[PDB]
């Protein structure tokens, strides 16, 4: 299964974008401009071999950014470490929450959810 070019991951739903302002006086305004460039969603693996939360998040901050750092970057996207970092933050935030949900779609079978 491949939701375009994943290869064998899930691809999440798209949601609002966190306002990431970093405590800086350029990184807020910088991100506020360029934020539309980022994937509005994240890639991931099933939590059914993870049990932690943060392990999953590293493993999906990996795949999401990796994909965009190879995939979009070959298709005439091109970003800096500075942008790749704003992506890093965004993906971290969105992925923790994707985890909380897919967790509630992994262990949930013992409840009604």
Curated annotation (Swiss-Prot):
Disulfide bonds join 60-95. Coiled coil: none annotated. Glycans are attached at residues 62, 78. N-glycosylated. Changing residue 71 to V: Linked to long incubation time; requires 2 nucleotide substitutions. A lipid is attached at residue 112 (GPI-anchor amidated serine). Highly expressed in the brain, lung, kidney and heart. Expressed at low levels in the liver and spleen. It is found in: Cell membrane; Golgi apparatus. Disruption phenotype: No visible phenotype. Mice develop chronic demyelinating polyneuropathy after 60 weeks. Mice show abnormally low iron levels throughout the body, and are mildly anemic. Iron accumulates in duodenum enterocytes, suggesting impaired transport from the intestine to the blood. Mice deficient for both Prnd and Prnp have the same phenotype as mice lacking Prnd; they are born at the expected Mendelian rate and appear grossly normal and healthy. Females are fertile, but males deficient for both Prnd and Prnp are sterile, in spite of normal mating behavior. Belongs to the prion family. It is linked to Found in high quantity in the brain of humans and animals infected with degenerative neurological diseases such as kuru, Creutzfeldt-Jakob disease (CJD), Gerstmann-Straussler syndrome (GSS), scrapie, bovine spongiform encephalopathy (BSE), transmissible mink encephalopathy (TME), etc. Its primary physiological function is unclear. May play a role in neuronal development and synaptic plasticity. May be required for neuronal myelin sheath maintenance. May promote myelin homeostasis through acting as an agonist for ADGRG6 receptor. May play a role in iron uptake and iron homeostasis. Soluble oligomers are toxic to cultured neuroblastoma cells and induce apoptosis (in vitro). Association with GPC1 (via its heparan sulfate chains) targets PRNP to lipid rafts. Also provides Cu(2+) or Zn(2+) for the ascorbate-mediated GPC1 deaminase degradation of its heparan sulfate side chains. The normal, monomeric form has a mainly alpha-helical structure. The disease-associated, protease-resistant form forms amyloid fibrils containing a cross-beta spine, formed by a steric zipper of superposed beta-strands. Disease mutations may favor intermolecular contacts via short beta strands, and may thereby trigger oligomerization. Contains an N-terminal region composed of octamer repeats. At low copper concentrations, the sidechains of His residues from three or four repeats contribute to the binding of a single copper ion. Alternatively, a copper ion can be bound by interaction with the sidechain and backbone amide nitrogen of a single His residue. The observed copper binding stoichiometry suggests that two repeat regions cooperate to stabilize the binding of a single copper ion. At higher copper concentrations, each octamer can bind one copper ion by interactions with the His sidechain and Gly backbone atoms. Monomer and homodimer. Has a tendency to aggregate into amyloid fibrils containing a cross-beta spine, formed by a steric zipper of superposed beta-strands. Soluble oligomers may represent an intermediate stage on the path to fibril formation. Copper binding may promote oligomerization. Interacts with GRB2, APP, ERI3/PRNPIP and SYN1. Mislocalized cytosolically exposed PrP interacts with MGRN1; this interaction alters MGRN1 subcellular location and causes lysosomal enlargement. Interacts with APP. Interacts with KIAA1191. Interacts with ADGRG6. This is Major prion protein. It comes from Mus musculus (Mouse). The gene is Prnp. The chain holds residues 120 to 231 of 254 of the full protein.
């Amino acid at each position: 299964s491949v939701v375009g070019g994943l290869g064998g991951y899930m691809l999440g739903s798209a949601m609002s974008r966190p306002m990431i302002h970093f405590g800086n006086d350029w990184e807020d305004r910088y991100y506020r401009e360029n934020m539309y460039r980022y994937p509005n969603q994240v890639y991931y693996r099933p939590v059914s071999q993870y049990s932690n939360q943060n392990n999953f998040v590293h493993d999906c901050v990996n795949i999401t950014i990796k994909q965009h750092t190879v995939t979009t970057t070959t298709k005439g996207e091109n970003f800096t470490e500075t942008d790749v970092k704003m992506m890093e933050r965004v993906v971290e935030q969105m992925c923790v929450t994707q985890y909380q949900k897919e967790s509630q779609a992994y262990y949930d079978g013992r409840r009604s959810s």
